[PDB]
Amino acid sequence: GPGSADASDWLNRLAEADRQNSFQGTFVYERNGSFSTHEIWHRVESDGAVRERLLQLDGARQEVVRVDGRTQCISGGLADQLADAQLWPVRKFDPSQLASWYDLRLVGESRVAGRPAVVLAVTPRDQHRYGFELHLDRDTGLPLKSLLLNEKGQLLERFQFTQLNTGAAPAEDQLQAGAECQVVAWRSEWLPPGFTLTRSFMTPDPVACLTYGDGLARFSVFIEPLMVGDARSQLGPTVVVSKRLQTDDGGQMVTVVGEVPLGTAERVALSIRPE
Secondary structure (H helix, E strand, C coil): CECCHHHHHHHHHHHHHHHHCCEEEEEEEEECCCCEEEEEEEEECCCCCEEEEEEECCCCCEEEEEECCEEEEECCCHHHHHHHHCCCCCCCCCHHHHCCCEEEEEEEEEEECCEEEEEEEEEECCCCCCEEEEEEECCCCCEEEEEEECCCCCEEEEEEEEEEECCCCCCHHHHCCCCCCEECCEEECCCCCCCEEEEEECCCCCCEEEEEECCCCEEEEEEEECCCCCCCCCCCCCEEEEEEEEECCEEEEEEEEECCCHHHHHHHHCCEEEC
């Protein structure tokens, strides 16, 4: 868990940050050498719903609108939506859940997006998960920068804001996507310790998704049925494993993405069972 009272307070401020701040900002995402830039609008509405829109600023015009974690509309093909399931610049953390699996040390202060921030070094307590370096907004607790690091200290993933405006909630129109944003049963029998199912949900073909988290890390497993002789291997750079598996409910294309070591991802995928 946290290694000082300071780390504890800041961990706490982090967990509150998602449901208590409205903001607009732009950030960079990098995962295993990929590079993309995104604008985000995030607003706590009247009924406390957390409403969110992401717009990819480069590459293909791609958008996602979420309400309390549930996606209202999304853009593009399958691989795009894989990339989206990982686009969680500001997520809900669960300090009590995560404290069993990580040690958290206050390193000092920093600057991100021109704002004062606080730095936590987050170290795993086993080899089933990666470490993080987290930079928390001094003012709001929001995660300005997140570095995913392996045991050898190599950078595997970067979330990093380039600008953040927490001074006034976005207007209604800023929370709405465009016409290209399209409207709108399995289990893992092995999970790494501490991981629980965060979320499950279901374009060219029907695909099931399971997102898992340990209070800190997030990874997702996509299960795509089957054409049977013409399988689609996900070949994106953020893909951790993509396997064709034979289950008791037929052939599945199983793809794991997110913040999860390869060996761990492989064990999860191989444990996927129908219900």
